[PDB]
Swiss-Prot record:
Residues 13-105 form the BACK domain. It comes from the Eukaryota. It comes from Homo sapiens (Human). As part of a BCR (BTB-CUL3-RBX1) E3 ubiquitin ligase complex, mediates the effects of the small molecule UM171 in enhancing hematopoietic stem and progenitor cell expansion ex vivo by specifically targeting the CoREST repressor complex for proteasomal degradation. Disulfide bonds: none annotated. Component of the BCR(KBTBD4) E3 ubiquitin ligase complex, at least composed of CUL3, KBTBD4 and RBX1. Substrate-specific adapter of a BCR (BTB-CUL3-RBX1) E3 ubiquitin ligase complex which targets CoREST corepressor complex components RCOR1, KDM1A/LSD1 and HDAC2 for proteasomal degradation. RCOR1 is likely to be the primary target while degradation of KDM1A and HDAC2 is likely due to their association with RCOR1. Also targets RCOR3, MIER2 and MIER3 for proteasomal degradation as well as associated proteins ZNF217 and RREB1. Degradation is dependent on the presence of an ELM2 domain in the target proteins. This is Kelch repeat and BTB domain-containing protein 4. Transmembrane segments: none annotated.
Length: 105
């Protein structure tokens, strides 16, 4: 019957992937990190995500994000937090931002 084990969840994906990266953990970091890029919104509407650094966020969006989960929206917010300086990261992040799914070269 319906049986499984403890793994990763879009909700606790950030926290997981975070520590993982800090502990040079590719297996985990990659896993959680992925689920994040796919479900960025679910995190963009949360504090943690906005509380995350630039290295983490950059990596996520760097791995390409599905047009489905409004990527820019998350960038604008996570940036607005401390736009005072993050601004620089906002522009650079925008140009770096990548979209998948749609047929565009």
């Amino acid at each position: 019957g319906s049986s499984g084990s403890s793994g990763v969840q879009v909700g606790n994906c950030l926290q997981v992937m975070w520590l993982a990266d800090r502990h040079s953990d590719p297996e985990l970091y990659t896993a959680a990190k992925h689920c994040a890029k796919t479900h960025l919104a679910q995190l963009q509407n949360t504090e943690e995500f906005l509380h995350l650094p630039h290295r983490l966020l950059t990596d996520i969006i760097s791995d390409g994000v599905p047009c489905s989960q409004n990527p820019t929206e998350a960038i604008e917010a996570w940036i607005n937090f401390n736009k005072e300086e993050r601004e620089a990261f906002a522009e650079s992040l925008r140009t770096s931002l990548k979209e998948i799914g749609e047929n565009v070269h």
